[PDB]
């Protein structure tokens, strides 16, 4: 049973790396935050090894990192994964970064002759905890096929999008752009409904079998709005960061997406008003403030 490396043991990485240990893998963990390392260790993971030592020793190494800088700091340079990867290693980045960085990563992997997949994930911490993540994978199909079963203990839907390394990332950004639209629509629509004294429960039962339906509507309303609980979940701040990546790509693709750009501002304002660390469904509360 394989040796897996896991770099980034935060909100997503901790439950993912824990699940691998529970699944019977020997898991070596690295995180800048020694407390995160402590938590992973208590789950049965092994700490104390360098990023470089993970690259030399592990069959597959996953990364779950919070920014493009962090991904760059881990993959590149004399101490990083690509320079130190043994000849059979597979690296799988689950971080969300720009398509361009996906390409820069792949180009360094091809130069070192190591395997690399850009496999961003969807489903949040709840999905990570429950092994129901969606993996959207760009990169070599042979590498996908040989690591599909490991990713399959972490997620419920494992997809290969195409051989293009940024194909996963792109579908993910699209997914999250749609989420931004759906959350905004629910937030504004329900505010109108409430101001006019609608029973939001009866309304949902009707709209949920109409063209008003969306999984996000069901999520936001049933799991947050109805129970008056805005504990993340998936933050206003994280959604706005993803919308940022999507608008960046739109701008690089010479596209003006007027409602998308407005939404970036909507979530940015929700944050600046103090809902940044609330669940995205709290956009409802932000829009309702005026009542």
On whether 11 is known to bind a ligand per the annotation, the reply is yes
DSSP conformation class of 279 = B
- The minimum distance between CB 255 and a copy of itself, in angstroms, equals 5
Site string for a copy of itself, 225-264 (x = CB under 8 A): ---------------------x--xx--xxxxxxxx-xx-
Q: Applying CB under 6 A, does 266 fall inside the site for ligand NAD?
A: no
- The listed partner (ligand NAD, a copy of itself, none) that binds 184, CB under 5 to 8 Å by sort, is a copy of itself
**Helix residue ranges per DSSP H, 76-140:** 81-84, 99-112, 124-130
* Contacted entry of ligand NAD, a copy of itself, none for residue 287, CB cut-off 5 to 8 Å set by kind: a copy of itself
**Residue 211 main-chain phi, psi, to 5 deg:** -65, -10
**Residues 77 and 52: beta-carbon distance below 8 Å:** no
The interface with ligand NAD within residues 155-184 (CB under 6 A) comprises none
In this chain, which of 3, 23, 26, 32 binds ligand NAD, going by CB under 6 A? 32
Least distance (Å) from a copy of itself to the CB of residue 203? 6
Question: With contact defined as beta carbons under 8 Å apart, do 151 and 91 qualify?
Answer: no
Does an H or E element contain 169, and which?
helix 167-195
Distance of alpha carbon 286 from alpha carbon 266, whole angstroms: 10
One character per residue 102-131, x = contact with a copy of itself (rule: CB under 8 A): --------------------xx--------
The alpha-carbon radius of gyration of the chain (Å, integer) is: 20
Distance CA 136, CA 153 (A): 15
**Range in contact with a copy of itself (rule: CB under 8 A) among 2-10, 30-38, 60-68, 214-222:** 214-222
Cβ-based nearer residue to a copy of itself, 198 or 273:
198
122 binds ligand NAD (CB under 6 A): yes
φ/ψ (deg, to 5) at 255: -120, 135
Q: Which of residues 88-117 bind ligand NAD (CB under 6 A)?
A: 94-96
State yes or no: residue 9 binds ligand NAD (CB under 6 A). yes
Q: How far is the CB of 71 from ligand NAD (least distance, A)?
A: 8
Phi, psi (deg, nearest 5) at residue 118: -100, 110
Beta bridge partners of 90: 60, 115
Q: At what angle do helices 236-252 and 258-270 cross, to 10 degrees?
A: 150
Binding mask 162-201 toward a copy of itself (x if CB under 8 A, else -) reads x-x-xx--xx-xxx-xxxxxx-xxx-xxxxxx-xxxxx--
Torsion of CA 57, 35, 134, 216, to 10 degrees: -170
Helix 167-195 × helix 258-270 angle, to 10° = 70
Q: Which residues are annotated as a binding site?
A: 11-12, 31, 65, 96
Q: Which residues are annotated as a binding site for NAD(+)?
A: 11-12, 31, 65, 96
Positions touching ligand NAD (CB under 6 A) are: 7-13, 30-33, 36, 64-66, 70, 73-74, 94-96, 121-122, 124-125, 234, 238
């Amino acid at each position: 049973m394989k040796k897996i490396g896991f770099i980034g043991l935060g909100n997503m990485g901790l439950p993912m790396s824990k699940n691998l240990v529970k699944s019977g893998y020997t898991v070596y963990g690295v995180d800048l935050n020694k407390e995160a390392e402590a938590s992973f260790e208590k789950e049965g993971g092994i700490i104390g090894l360098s990023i470089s030592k993970l690259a030399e020793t592990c069959d597959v190494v996953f990364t779950s990192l919070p920014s493009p800088r962090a991904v760059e700091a881990v993959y590149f340079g004399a101490e990083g994964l690509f320079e130190n990867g043994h000849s059979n290693v597979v690296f799988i980045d689950t971080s969300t970064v720009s398509p361009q960085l996906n390409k820069q990563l792949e180009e360094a992997a091809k130069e070192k002759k190591v395997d690399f997949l850009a496999a961003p994930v969807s489903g949040g911490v709840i999905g990570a905890e429950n092994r129901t993540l969606t993996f959207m994978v760009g990169g070599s199909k042979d590498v996908y096929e040989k690591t599909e079963s490991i990713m399959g203990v972490l997620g419920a839907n494992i997809f290969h999008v195409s051989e293009q390394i940024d194909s996963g990332t792109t579908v993910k950004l699209i997914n999250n752009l749609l989420i931004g639209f759906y959350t905004a629509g629910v937030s504004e629509a329900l505010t109108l409904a409430k101001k006019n004294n609608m029973d939001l429960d009866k309304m949902f039962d009707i709209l949920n079998v109409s063209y008003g339906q969306s999984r996000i509507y069901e999520r936001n309303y049933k799991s947050f709005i109805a129970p008056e609980n805005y504990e993340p979940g998936f933050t206003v701040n994280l959604l706005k960061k993803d919308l940022g990546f999507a608008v960046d790509l739109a701008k690089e693709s010479e596209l003006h997406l007027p409602v998308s750009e407005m939404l970036l501002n909507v979530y940015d304002e929700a944050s600046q008003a103090g809902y940044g660390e609330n669940d995205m469904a709290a956009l409802y509360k932000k829009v309702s403030e005026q009542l």
